[PDB]
Amino acid sequence: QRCYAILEEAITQLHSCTEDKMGAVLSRQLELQREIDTMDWSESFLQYLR
Amino acid sequence: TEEQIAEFKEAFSLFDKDGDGTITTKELGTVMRSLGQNPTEAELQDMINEVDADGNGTIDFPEFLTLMARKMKDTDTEEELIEAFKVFDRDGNGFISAAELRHVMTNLGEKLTDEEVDEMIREADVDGDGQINYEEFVKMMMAK
Amino acid sequence: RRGREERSLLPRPTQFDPVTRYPHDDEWVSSGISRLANCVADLTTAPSAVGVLEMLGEQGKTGKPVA
Amino acid sequence: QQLMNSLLLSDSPDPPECHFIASVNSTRI
Amino acid sequence: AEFLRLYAVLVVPRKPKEAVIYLLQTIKFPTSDYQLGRSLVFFRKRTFLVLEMQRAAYLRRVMPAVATLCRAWPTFRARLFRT
């Protein structure tokens, strides 16, 4: 049971380390995707005014 | 309303056993039950008056159309009875367990007898395990 | 749609079917609680902390207070 | 006052279900 | 007697007194605000306000449902000949 304990600490270390490693990149991807989709949506409105 | 007349000549001929367009007055009340609306018991004798208006002793297809056009309640629509059993679906799994439907409207409702509500539990629950898949059981209202 | 630990401790879930081997004096019966086994005496059917809730919950769903 | 009692005596199986109000002053009168 | 019909349905899925008592424990009604009475049982409005919030939720909408629960049996059989 202690064997599973010292592996469970390894699992929680891996998930905590990948949560803040992926936190910066995936926030930036969704921010860039927001820019593409907002600017393409704003270009579709000027086509309507055209 | 060619579609509505089409629904009329379905159930008028479905309980019809003599055949040539003439139905006896016994199953006349139950024909409208397959149209899907509520009677008063006084309407049954009010229909017999025009059964023997020409001394027919039976329903002719035009007089079923004209009297049904005089009085027409709101037909229970098909999606509203999807929803009418979805409101009893507190579980979210799409199943209405048979013990749930017994208790909750017998103390509710306006015209409900104990034999009428026991027999709808039994016939709906053909599997016997005690659940009613209402997406299949209100297609057991609207095949067509 | 029942778990493997659920099916190993209670394969027939409204009666007992005893499974203990307490003084130690399907043969292959064991939960997932231990991964050390080379013989039938090692197989502990000890319920898990989550197993003793998923299949201690399936008794209010068996009955339905009268009908 | 007995006529006010006599309308109490007329029908009323239950007593007349009441609603009351007091009209007093903020300071001492 | 009015307590039976006005507080039917509810949480529950023998005697007239015993069923009224059985309703009380099942609805989280404490025994402190209960009165030893015969028929006209006094209630102290607070606890009736507790129950009436979920009573209206239990009433809801059933009337299009019972509009066809009265009339279902030939519309079964005629459909088996419809299909």
Add this chain to the structure above:
Amino acid sequence: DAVLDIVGGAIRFGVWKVARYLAERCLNFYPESHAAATQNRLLVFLIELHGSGLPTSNPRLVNLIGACGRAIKDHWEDTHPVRLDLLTYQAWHMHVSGDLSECAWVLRSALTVAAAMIGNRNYTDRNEVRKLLMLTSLSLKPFRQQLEATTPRQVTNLRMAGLLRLLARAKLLWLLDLDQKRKCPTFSSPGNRSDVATEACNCLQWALDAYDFHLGSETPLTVGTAYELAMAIFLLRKATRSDEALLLVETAARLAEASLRVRTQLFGRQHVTTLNTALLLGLLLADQGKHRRAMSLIEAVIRNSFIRSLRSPARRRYRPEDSFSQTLWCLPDAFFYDTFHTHGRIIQPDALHDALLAHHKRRIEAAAMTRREQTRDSYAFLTHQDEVPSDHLIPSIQDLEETLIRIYINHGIDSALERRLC
């Protein structure tokens, strides 16, 4: 805890009026929410339940439970097992006040809370670790079988398996209180008779094999669950009356024998426990048809139980080991006598039940034919032959000799002696 120790000096001893006085001033020596105070707050709750003349349905009792559970959610919000000692004190509270069907819900919530306390992982990535294994590794394994967890699920520990024993206690006591109160027909219909019996059997099942995993199968605590699983099976067969349960009676007497061997070697032969791990084994062996091993064992009960009554009445005290006894450490010993050994004193004379000879067809027919909780343990005694409440607890020498001679003339005795008798 020194002032709380003199509080415990007055709870067990019926000095309740003093116990209220220093309990109110004990709570001043703790900060406001401060979940370390749950020892005092529960002890005050024990005074108001046992100690005051008010009944077991006071608004004081729900107010004290709510005020102490609030203090856990303030300091150690749903993350300390003082939530569980509130759930065991509340379970003791309503165990006193009847409603054993509701006490099953309390211990159910105690089991559900303790499951979150122990915790579990989800492992949502098992499908894509399998995708990596099927790409890199060389086995048949990652294609036609899902990948197992890296570390498996958690073990049921000592206390949470204690709540399993208490849940089976509420279920079995609910079964047999209605069995001795069968005058009302709306008490435990026969469909529920099998259901609550066989799953109180399953809860005692679960507590037994969790205990021999942790403490090993030699401690008194495993022996208590092994004997009680045998007792629960004995009541399961009686309620269902199913003839296919011969597999259950085999493991029942085989559980009672293992409890008997250890209890002889841990509590001696003159002890309240060791007399009914042999007495229950006597009923389960005469159940099978072993009518002389069960005979000689019931024979052995009224030897050692009689030698127990040779001892001093002041020197005969039994407190049952039970998770209520451990959590509620200070109570009079008489508060836990009811649950399963007056059960034994009721079942033992009634299970065999011959009658239907003269004195039953003569002393009934002809006789009718002629016409015209402030209870402390007793500390000081009067004479050497007094009556301890542990002596009511065991069946008397009068009525278990009664079962003994009834076994003989009916289905015991070799063919030689009953030939010489008639």
Add this chain to the structure above:
Amino acid sequence: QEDKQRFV
């Protein structure tokens, strides 16, 4: 007891 005890 011939095909199911073979845990070796």
Add this chain to the structure above:
Amino acid sequence: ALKVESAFCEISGASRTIQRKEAVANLARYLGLAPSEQEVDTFFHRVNGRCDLAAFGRFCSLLVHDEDKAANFRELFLVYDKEHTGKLKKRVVKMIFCNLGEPLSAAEWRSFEGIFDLADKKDDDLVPYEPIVRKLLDLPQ
């Protein structure tokens, strides 16, 4: 699938596409399967006017039905024949086809007596319904 592609090419021809509502119903039972008018209507609605080989290919497969059994189709005639004599009237078989179910045009209903031998019988003549059940589901008579 070989009979599916062989029958599809002989009707669509060089276009390899069926745009006729009536021709979709023909190609269904040249493979041997009978669709309803509503089934081909909602099929034509989803394929929005063009019927290619891939769409009709599994249209053969989704209409493979395992309830064209005799016991279900004798249940129609059993209820109307309350005396259970195995007989109904020729007027009775007229209404169950042209009025019950979806209604029939006078043309293709007229070809029904020409093959099933009911034209020479009068309105009130008596017919056994077992030959109609047996001949329709292509069981040998």
Add this chain to the structure above:
Amino acid sequence: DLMSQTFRHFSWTDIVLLNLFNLTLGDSSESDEFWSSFLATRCSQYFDVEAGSIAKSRISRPALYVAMQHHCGISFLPDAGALNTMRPSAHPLQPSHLRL
């Protein structure tokens, strides 16, 4: 707060308490900085538990609060249940909240 008091004097040792207690207990991004850069790395070189396990999300805000109330040696007027029924703030604890 220093505006409002007219009687209760304070010290700078009170201020360094309050800046520490609010960078540990608060909703601010400043307290997010403390738990991710300082409180995590200091646990690694003090008691040999790594920075990944130390997180602000899976810690109890009131039970930690009483834990510094005993370990640091300071008592506050609010309690563990007090902070739970307090609105989140950048600096929830204030210098009037001290006792001695």
Add this chain to the structure above:
Amino acid sequence: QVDESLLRRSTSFLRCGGHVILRSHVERHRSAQVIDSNFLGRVLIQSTDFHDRFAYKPDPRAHPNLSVDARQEVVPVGCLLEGKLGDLLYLSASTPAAVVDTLRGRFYHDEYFTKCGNMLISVFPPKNRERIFDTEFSEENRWQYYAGEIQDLRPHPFLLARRALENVWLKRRNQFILTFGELDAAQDNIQKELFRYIYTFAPRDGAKDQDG
């Protein structure tokens, strides 16, 4: 007297910054603000001589009046049921002091008329009395509180009469209205303004034809 629940360390609580009643100078009567709850076993308090609870601070005040008292003579009374609505029917305190103290704040905030369970209290002073009636009985507000179906309506004689007139419309059982007061203390003017409300709304035999 008060219930024993508030004089108890377990069931009732003190959080710093809550109001409290000091049980001394009995014929109560003293209000105080909580600073600390475990000062050396006792409760430290600040006897006094628009604050949210939600920030807990003592009231900043020069020259404090601190005193030590145990938790056998302090009751939490405030928050900074009890008649939360204008209908003060609820009344978390059994004593009449809850009715009087709620009417203290209702006198300061000038709403005055106050449905009291079955009762009602109006405590309007002799100063320009006709202005007080004319706001609460103007022909505007006359049809206003007919129009709302209670709920959001202010607890007024309009609701007091509408209770009896709804048991006119449905119950058809006997009802009763009555006003109290002292020597010419405008209770007659309360009743007559209430009386006009009885037959204003509802069509009370609108003039029909010859048939009926």
